[PDB]
UniProtKB/Swiss-Prot annotation, chain A:
Region (Sigma-70 factor domain-3): 1-52
Purpose of the protein: Sigma factors are initiation factors that promote the attachment of RNA polymerase to specific initiation sites and are then released. This sigma factor is the primary sigma factor during exponential growth. Preferentially transcribes genes associated with fast growth, such as ribosomal operons, other protein-synthesis related genes, rRNA- and tRNA-encoding genes and prfB.
Name the record gives this protein: RNA polymerase sigma factor RpoD
Domains as described in the record: Contains 4 domains, connected by flexible linkers. In the active conformation, the domains are in an extended conformation, each making extensive interactions with the RNA polymerase catalytic core.
Assembly: Interacts transiently with the RNA polymerase catalytic core formed by RpoA, RpoB, RpoC and RpoZ (2 alpha, 1 beta, 1 beta' and 1 omega subunit) to form the RNA polymerase holoenzyme that can initiate transcription. Identified in a complex containing RpoD, the RNA polymerase subunits RpoA, RpoB and RpoZ, CRP and DNA. Interacts with Rsd; this prevents interaction with the RNA polymerase catalytic core and with promoter DNA, and as a consequence, promotes transcription from promoters that require alternative sigma factors.
Residues of the full protein shown: 458 to 509 of 613
The encoding gene: rpoD
Organism for this UniProt entry: Escherichia coli (strain K12)
UniProtKB/Swiss-Prot annotation, chain B:
Example of a GO biological process term: response to heat
Residues modified to N6-acetyllysine: K1020, K1198
Consequence of changing I559S: Resistant to antibiotics salinamide A and B
UniProt biotechnology annotation: Co-administration of salinamide and rifampicin or salinamide and myxopyronin suppresses the emergence of resistance to both antibiotics.
Keyword Acetylation carried by entry: yes
Keyword set, alphabetical order: Acetylation, Antibiotic resistance, DNA-directed RNA polymerase, Nucleotidyltransferase, Transcription, Transferase
Similarity section: Belongs to the RNA polymerase beta chain family.
Protein name per its UniProtKB record: DNA-directed RNA polymerase subunit beta
Coiled coil, from the record: none
GO cellular component entries: cytoplasm; cytosol; cytosolic DNA-directed RNA polymerase complex; membrane; transcription elongation factor complex
Amino acid sequence: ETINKLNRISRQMLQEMGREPTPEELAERMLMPEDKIRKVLKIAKEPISMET
Amino acid sequence: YSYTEKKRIRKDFGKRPQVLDVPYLLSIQLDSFQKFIEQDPEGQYGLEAAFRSVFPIQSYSGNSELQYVSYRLGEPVFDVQECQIRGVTYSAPLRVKLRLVIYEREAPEGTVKDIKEQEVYMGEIPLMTDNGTFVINGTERVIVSQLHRSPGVFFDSDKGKTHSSGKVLYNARIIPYRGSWLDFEFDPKDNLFVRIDRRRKLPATIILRALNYTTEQILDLFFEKVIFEIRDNKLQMELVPERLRGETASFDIEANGKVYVEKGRRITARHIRQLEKDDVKLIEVPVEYIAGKVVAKDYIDESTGELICAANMELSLDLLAKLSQSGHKRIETLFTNDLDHGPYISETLRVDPTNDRLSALVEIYRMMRPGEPPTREAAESLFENLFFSEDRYDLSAVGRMKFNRSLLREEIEGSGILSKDDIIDVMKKLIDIRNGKGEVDDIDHLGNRRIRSVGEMAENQFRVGLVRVERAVKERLSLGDLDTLMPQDMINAKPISAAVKEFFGSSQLSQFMDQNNPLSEITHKRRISALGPGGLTRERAGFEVRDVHPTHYGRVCPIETPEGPNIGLINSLSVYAQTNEYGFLETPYRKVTDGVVTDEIHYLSAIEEGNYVIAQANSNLDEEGHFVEDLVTCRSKGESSLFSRDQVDYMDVSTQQVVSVGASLIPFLEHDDANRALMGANMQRQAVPTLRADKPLVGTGMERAVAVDSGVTAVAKRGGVVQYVDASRIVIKVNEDEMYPGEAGIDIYNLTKYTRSNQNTCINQMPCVSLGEPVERGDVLADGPSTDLGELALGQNMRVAFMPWNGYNFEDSILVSERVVQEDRFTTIHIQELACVSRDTKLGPEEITADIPNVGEAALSKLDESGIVYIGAEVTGGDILVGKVTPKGETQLTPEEKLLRAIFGEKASDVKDSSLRVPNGVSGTVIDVQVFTRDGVEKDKRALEIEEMQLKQAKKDLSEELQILEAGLFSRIRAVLVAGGVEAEKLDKLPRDRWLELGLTDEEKQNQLEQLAEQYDELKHEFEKKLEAKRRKITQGDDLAPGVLKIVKVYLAVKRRIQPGDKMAGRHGNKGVISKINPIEDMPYDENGTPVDIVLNPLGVPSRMNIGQILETHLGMAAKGIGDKINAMLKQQQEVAKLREFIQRAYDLGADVRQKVDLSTFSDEEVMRLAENLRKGMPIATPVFDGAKEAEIKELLKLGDLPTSGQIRLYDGRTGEQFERPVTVGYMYMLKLNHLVDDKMHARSTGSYSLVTQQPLGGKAQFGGQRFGEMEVWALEAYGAAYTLQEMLTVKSDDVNGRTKMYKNIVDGNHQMEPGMPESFNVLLKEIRSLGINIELEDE
């Protein structure tokens, strides 16, 4: 749910600001202390296939 | 001549006056991407085409529609240099004005309730640089132009191979630009068939029954009607006499008194013409001739409605007796023949199961989505969405042009979708090809080959993004509210930017620019690939695509393609060739009148070439344009033949149009075999840029176009007087006439110093102009890598002797004197980029501290207090550049190691040395250090030091920009105030602020003062705001990977000289590995005493048929002989009249040429600098197929004191006695290819091992291991070697116990192996055992 909130808010802000949102903007955009947003961004990565 | 043209003017042979100069060599890339991103007011190709095609988006009949207005691209946030430093795309945003409307109740034409019009962001698209290069992820990438089949209609044969019957088939094919294909083909027994894809063979006429056609009008469209009337009796036959051609009748055909056609006789056309002259329309036949005919339409009884005969039925006597009693005397039959009119459609109808429209649509909908039951309206919408929907099927303007052209239509425009007339005309044309008239096509023909480019492929991926987003917009506007949103919440910019970044980031057509040579850039941008999406692959295709078709002449170079797996699929675009409006290739020719060759030129495509007949470039004509013979060699239709004097239509432009830019820089290319010329032009890319640049003595005249018109050198945009020359910058004072009235200024050119190219070589710019020198517009100022004075200097010219010298030149080997390596004339400069990342593990974060466990202080003396190496400390292999330690824990110590720790009390530390180290076996200098740090992390001391360094550098540099720019501006102000109110000595005392506000007469001069004043103030404010912007770009944080703290990058500059093992090559394809690097004392030397520098091998020259290296060697000897005579006449201090005389004789010298020269140059100041530039050797241009012959080389050698035969006697360096049979010495221009040996050499004792199978993983510098593959195992089986193989694939490679047992036994000095079992075989057992298959090992 947190990952889908991050993708939704970073979908909304990308057409508001224009470049892409930095997580410093996600600090004041959301209610999380921006050091947890880094690890939520880290956990949400699917592993590479080892035959890629 | 211009100013650098008279600096060192190149002697030019050649006999053809060039009438069209070499065009802008990168026009494909830049012109394509100018078609891509440009505000086109119409439906011209571009982004406007994609928007106007995919928009308007409408709701699911909910009366809410989104339509389009315009777009705009913003300026990039980051310029190209900072973009290459940081790693982002060099991109631009994409603002689009969109307009949302909602309609009201029961008014489709009525007024909307509201409109909502705003701008919206949809992704970033990358911009092309000024040279044709994109930047995607830190690197500099080139998108190669693609070659594929033109959308349209192709009539192929596919002869013979089907079922070995000897019969040819024919297949027509409609290839769209976007949609499903279409095929029509015959079978071995004369039945037509349709295919909507490469799916199952369907009967043909069902697609006609899918277009609302009954059997009547199908047979009407594909056949002509023979009318049988019963004129009162006997069932007569109406006759057109042309219908009887080539036929044999079974009876006597009589017309108007006379029996013309006899029974059992073939009908001659004399009978036909007599029947035409005798006014013959209707003749009498028996009832037996209708036994073979087939009825056209439906015949019934009138009142009862019963069927006499349905359509497409043969007629027997029973059906004739049935149609006699109903009363019908009109009979319509189908005209058949075995040669002229084949009854193919009738046979296809007899094969076809269906009858009506609905069963046809049911058959197609069952035969495209099989297994599911059909439905009427779903089948109707399917066949709507196959070929006739505007959405899922599209021929472009090129598709419609070829589709009309190969059907011999009139209009060259039309709708994208098909129509009934289109498919019916294609079927008519296919039946006509089967009936013997017309011809098939061939796919190698470059009139049926379209060349795509960057703009078109980016446009198509952008359209993929727009349909992927319009699915979501249809989903949203179907659920669309009334007023809750500005119209940007509907659209996501993830798919659009995702698609375009996926194309530029990952494709077979978008690759790293080969950037180690200006030639390599300019020929990688000019590349015509046939691979990639929408094109053939190396596995599937194919031989005819690899081969050269005769329509490649002057469009695609035949002698440049990468020899290897893909030969000919990676073609290169010819020199003079452009790209047509419709995308095809087209080449220049000179229009020929009655006899006079006019200098006007017409670009001709391939299918327009075959109609005309085209003359030869190598022809001879007087000043009146008349050919000197009455017959001349030409080509008409792919056939070289000799035609008349005034039958010609076009002449070739120049002698060079058949080759590429890569091959045309091989001189004497007409004297080499095409194999070695292919290899020579294939390897002329791979020259490393040497430390100097050294002017090829044997050039082809194409060197200046490749030098200027690439992107490496700095071309002046406005000429003037050179004000300031530094290695960093060149500052030009523009002349008065070339200067704009507003924004006066002067020009400044910031050179690019020592920096990293993609192939690790050092791209560098160096000034070639001095202070206070006049320059022309378009004149070179700063030589790039491998460029001298605006020429192309790929390598260096060296004295060569062709003799076998003690076997050191055995197979192909080169042998070089020490005079080369002492001069550092092949010493090249490489730049490597080592990187040290510092992440955050879950055991703790890493540090960049200088304190490292268990290293010496002497190993750390090359570091600072911050732990990052100083700039400019020569390091070797193993030195520590970035001291980085990673936290670890839980040591799990053993027995007696734990005993030892207890004894000595030494704490096993909580950290591990994972520092960045120099790779094994290089050297060099640390020249540039960068520290990227995530924002919110403490920046250490050297990071702030680098920030202060770059901040002072940017502020000093922009202050110098503003200061020298306003120095030019105040020097213009002084030139203004002298005219009309001079202060000669009064002006320079009063300050610069009080020049802008001094009074003067109201004229254009006061308006000029107002302009220069406001430009001063605008540049001041612009300076201030862009300095603040540059500071906020430098000081801010940097985006990084998720979960990495900081990255320290260190640029090494290695200076690699030469050693045995390197590779060198002339431009003719004579490869060679330097074998021994002799001292100067051992070289062969002639009687003057000059030691030859490179001794090649003569045995390669008769075998490999490249004789042109000998001619290039002789003419190089000629060039350096002229250079030595000029050097002697300059060393003796001869007066300038003697030098003028000798240079005049050197430049006249030969047949009728194209090289008129001085005396028009200055008295001393231009001639003496020319002689200073000719003392190393007078260059010679040889335009490729037209240039210098043998007798001109002999006459140039007679100008020097050299022997005419070109072979000096030479003395051995060791025995000191003369070689018998005097040998060929000369000056060959040779190149150092970048297959250097120290990048290739490594070895492995014991390193890492692969995870899934315990084997040493292969690579470099992963320590690799030479893969002892399957053939080498067969080789050791072929010997008696068995212990070698047992250790070769168990102990040295695979066994997890055996390798450590072997290492122990070796360091104990006991050579012995304990073999055991390989590990990967145990993996194989677990893999078969992890199937349902039991596999075991057995008892004893």
